[PDB]
Amino acid sequence: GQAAADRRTVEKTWALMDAVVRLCQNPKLQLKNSPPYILDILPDTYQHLRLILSKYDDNQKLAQLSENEYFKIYIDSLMKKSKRAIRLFKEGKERMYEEQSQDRRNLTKLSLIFSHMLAEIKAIFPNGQFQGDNFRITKADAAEFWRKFFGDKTIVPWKVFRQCLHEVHQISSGLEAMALKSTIDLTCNDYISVFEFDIFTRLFQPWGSILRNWNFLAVTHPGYMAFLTYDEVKARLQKYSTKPGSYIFRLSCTRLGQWAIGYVTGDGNILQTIPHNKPLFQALIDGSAEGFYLYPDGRSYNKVTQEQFELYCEMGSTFQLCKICAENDKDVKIEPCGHLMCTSCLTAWQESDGQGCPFCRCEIKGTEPIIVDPFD
Ligand SMILES: C[C@H]1CCCN(Cc2cc3c(c(C(F)(F)F)c2)CN(c2cccc([C@]4(c5nncn5C)C[C@@H](C)C4)c2)C3=O)C1
Ligand SMILES: [Zn+2]
Ligand SMILES: [Zn+2]
């Protein structure tokens, strides 16, 4: 059985979440209002988990929840990300109190992850009852791909998902697979939920050209600003208040799967809109043709490089993966150049007579084992 281990894991989960909440209540942080608001999200997550348990009343129901693969992965993921937030405060020290620090950007990355996890658990356990197996994917052709490979599965490991997706839409390099992972795996748990799949396929519709749409709208488009608040959109566009047709487009924590566009009017007002019954690309060319959307991020704009994939990857939390394969963790440092990669890729390059370091071609005088954090 798992009864007693399961009881222990839930209670450790709530202890670790309470620990993160207490560290975040430090007035020296000034994040009481800085949203996604970790001091709202973690209590809301606790609240939804209690609602789930409130519905899985007794020994027999609790045993069904125990056997739910999505629920097991969710609680494990919540424990790991809580431990990570604790470690960030222990290792970050007074840098947690500097707004611009890498340590504080990492707290923002964990806050976004917690926000996405709360949206996902509400989508999969609406009113605290499992509905993963009945989840209706928004885009018909995306929904057919998920039925075809995964049936009524709620969640699939990233490695399995990447292999099945590659059957229909070829993924090119390691840096593209890594960039794609960072886009679909919002919860950063190395799984793709049916919910995550729904969000990605809604944003980058149509399905027929989905990797080209994502490459063009997110990976290389100068107008794309990832997740922003309404206040951040005003702050960025204010710099172009005197150049009407200046625009950006962005994601919303509070409205997963939807785009929002901000633009500068003839009067220098900043307005925001959500594309109305059209995909983003159509909204952008239509608004372009009408004079609203002329200057992405305040400049004119007139098939993706490895460098462009690598720059996109830095926004996320995937620094532990080897850039060559995007499968194995970085476990070796090449010396003296200091480039990082997995042993497997190092071997394959020196196997096939590659000069020196795969990245910089320089003499390899030494290697040293290394553990790289996803947030490094
Ligand atoms: C909602 C508000 C909260 C306060 C911070 N601002 C600005 C900001 C945006 C992102 C981030 C930060 C910070 F954590 F690094 F600091 C800061 C991180 N971040 C982020 C984290 C993981 C993945 C991604 C996506 C992405 N977009 N371009 C590249 N990548 C990997 C968007 C997903 C569909 C894939 C983006 C922001 O959007 C956003
Ligand atoms: Zn590798
Ligand atoms: Zn090198």
Numbering used by the authors: 37 to 338, 354 to 427
How did the manuscript describe this experimental structure?
The human Casitas B lymphoma-b (Cbl-b) protein is a member of the monomeric Cbl family of RING-type E3 ubiquitin ligases that are known to downregulate non-receptor and receptor protein tyrosine kinase (PTK) signaling by ubiquitinating and thereby targeting these kinases for proteasomal or lysosomal degradation. The Cbl family of E3 ligases share a highly conserved N-terminal region that contains the structural elements required for ubiquitin ligase activity, including a substrate recognition tyrosine kinase-binding domain (TKBD), a short linker helix region (LHR) and a RING finger domain. The LHR comprises an N-terminal loop (linker loop 1), a helix, and a C-terminal loop (linker loop 2) and contains a strictly conserved tyrosine residue (Y363 in Cbl-b) within the linker helix (LH) that is essential for regulating the Cbl proteins E3 ligase activity. Specifically, Cbl-b is a negative regulator of signaling pathways involving immune cell receptors, and it is particularly well-documented to play a central role in inhibiting effector T cell activation.
To further characterize the C7683 interaction with Cbl-b and understand its mechanism of action, we co-crystallized the N-terminal E3 ligase fragment of Cbl-b containing the TKBD, LHR and RING domains (residue range 38–427) in complex with C7683. To improve the crystal packing and obtain better diffracting crystals, we introduced three-point mutations on the surface of the Cbl-b TKB domain by mutating residues K51, K55, R325 to alanines (the mutant protein referred to here as 3mCbl-b), which yielded crystals diffracting to 1.8 Å resolution. These mutations are located far from the substrate binding site as well as the regulatory regions involved in Cbl-b activation. A well-resolved electron density map was observed for the entire C7683 molecule and Cbl-b protein, except for residues 339–353 in the flexible linker helix region (LHR). C7683 was nestled in an interface between the 3 TKBD subdomains and the LHR, consistent with our biophysical studies, which showed that the compound binding does not involve the RING domain. C7683 binds in an extended conformation, making extensive interactions with the residues of all three TKBD subdomains, the LHR and coordinating a nearby water molecule (HOH10). The methyl-substituted piperidine ring is nestled in a pocket between the 4H and the SH2 subdomains, where it makes hydrophobic and van der Waals contacts with C289, T265, P71 and P72, in addition to a hydrogen bonding interaction between its nitrogen atom (N31) and the side chain oxygen (OE1) of E268 in the SH2 domain. The Isoindolin-1-one ring is also located between 4H and SH2 subdomains, making hydrophobic interactions with atoms from T144, K145, L148 in the 4H domain and L264 in the SH2, and hydrogen bonds to the backbone nitrogen of F263 in the SH2 domain through its oxygen atom.
